[PDB]
Each structure stands twice: as structure tokens, then as C-alpha cells.
């Protein structure tokens, strides 16, 4: 593993750590979800974003929060407010910015130093 693939893992772990059933973790079929493919023209999950790691895929932090932000959008447009997974997706949403904060990531731009 690289520098930025182990950094990258970690703010993933603590991403999953909110979604203990791993509800996030593979593609929303449209079994489970009638009209999914429809009304959401840009899938994401966890485990997609577990391969583009491991395919250092990802060059920026920046691009790896950008699929955060995808994953979670897509569970706020497709579920409605009452449901499990809207709620989750909140969760998630916070916790991840708090982590990946424009502040915290300069501080470790700096401990580069
Ligand atoms: C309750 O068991 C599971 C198992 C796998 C899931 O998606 C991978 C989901 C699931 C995940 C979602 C999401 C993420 O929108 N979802 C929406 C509607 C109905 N089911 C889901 C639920």
C-alpha cells in the first residue's frame, strides 16, 4: 500500500463504522428499490469505493470526497425523510465532513512538513 491508499483507507473505516449493517456497502438493486436505475442516473457505495482504492484510482482527497458526497446525495433524492436510510445517510454525511474538514486536512498538510 501507498501513503495516500493507507490515509484513504482509514477515513473509509470510519465512514463504514456508521453503516454497521452495511446497507451502503453494495449497489441498490431495483428489486429492492423499485425504479432506482431510473431516478438515479449515478450509483454509488462503499464497496465501489473500496475498488477504486485499491485501483489507486482516487489522486486527491478531493476525489475520494466527491463519492462520499455522491453516496450520500443519492440516499436523500431516492428515500424519503421518515425512512432508515435517509437517516443514515445524514449520519454519515456529518460525520464525514467533520472528518475530512477544509481545517483538519490543512493541519495535515502540515504535519507534512
Ligand atoms: C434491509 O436490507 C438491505 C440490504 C441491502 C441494501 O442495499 C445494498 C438495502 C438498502 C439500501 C438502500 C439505500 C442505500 O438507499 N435501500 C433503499 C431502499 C430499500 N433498501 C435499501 C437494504
Redesign the pocket.
Given at each position: 500500500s501507498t501513503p495516500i491508499q493507507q490515509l484513504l483507507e482509514h477515513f473509509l473505516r470510519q465512514l463504514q463504522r456508521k453503516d454497521p449493517?452495511?446497507?451502503?456497502?453494495?449497489?441498490?438493486?431495483d428489486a429492492?428499490?423499485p425504479g432506482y436505475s431510473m431516478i438515479i442516473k449515478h450509483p454509488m457505495?462503499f464497496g465501489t469505493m473500496k475498488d477504486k482504492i485499491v485501483a489507486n484510482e482516487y489522486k486527491s482527497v478531493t476525489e475520494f470526497k466527491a463519492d462520499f458526497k455522491l453516496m450520500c446525495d443519492?440516499?436523500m433524492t431516492?428515500?424519503r425523510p421518515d425512512?432508515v436510510?435517509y437517516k443514515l445517510?445524514k449520519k454519515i454525511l456529518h460525520a464525514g465532513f467533520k472528518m475530512m474538514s477544509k481545517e483538519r486536512l490543512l493541519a495535515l498538510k502540515r504535519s507534512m512538513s
Open positions: 449493517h452495511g446497507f451502503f456497502a453494495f449497489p441498490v438493486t429492492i428499490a457505495d443519492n440516499a431516492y428515500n425512512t436510510y445517510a
